């Protein structure tokens, strides 16, 4: 069916090169990766304590 995993050179000239260099010079995407866990911290966890609460089952 074909889907292709390779990007085949995202940077070409001037504008497309600098932003691909900016993420490697400092971080940016690591700070963006930091934000993924940041919002994940605030949302309520699905946890069941066994001696009081019980997990889902079936007939």
């Amino acid at each position: 069916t074909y889907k292709y995993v390779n990007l085949r050179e995202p940077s070409m000239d001037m504008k497309s090169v600098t932003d691909r260099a900016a993420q490697t010079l400092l971080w940016t995407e690591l700070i963006r990766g930091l934000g993924m866990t940041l919002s994940y911290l605030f949302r309520e966890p699905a946890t069941i304590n066994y001696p009081f609460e019980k997990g889902p089952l079936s007939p």
């Binding site: 504008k15 600098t18 932003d19 900016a22 400092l26 940016t28 963006r32």
Partner: protein, 69 residues
């Protein structure tokens, strides 16, 4: 009457949709804030060191003024 499991699709959950997109940072605009904070950083810091000089000379003047010491 026969009752079995019914079919339901409705929205089809959207088959393969991209969620990753560029947000906040653009490229050239981040350098204007990045290097801009540096130029603001030095100018604010060096003015305090010039104010430190006002204290510095006045501190060493106390030693020259004190000869009975």
């Amino acid at each position: 009457x026969x009752x079995x499991x019914x079919x339901x699709x409705x929205x089809x959950x959207x088959x393969x949709x991209x969620x990753x997109x560029x947000x906040x940072x653009x490229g050239y605009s981040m350098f204007a804030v990045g290097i801009g904070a540096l130029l603001f950083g030095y100018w604010s810091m060096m003015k305090w060191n010039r104010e430190r000089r006002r204290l510095q000379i006045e501190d060493f003047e106390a030693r020259i003024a004190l000869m009975p010491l």
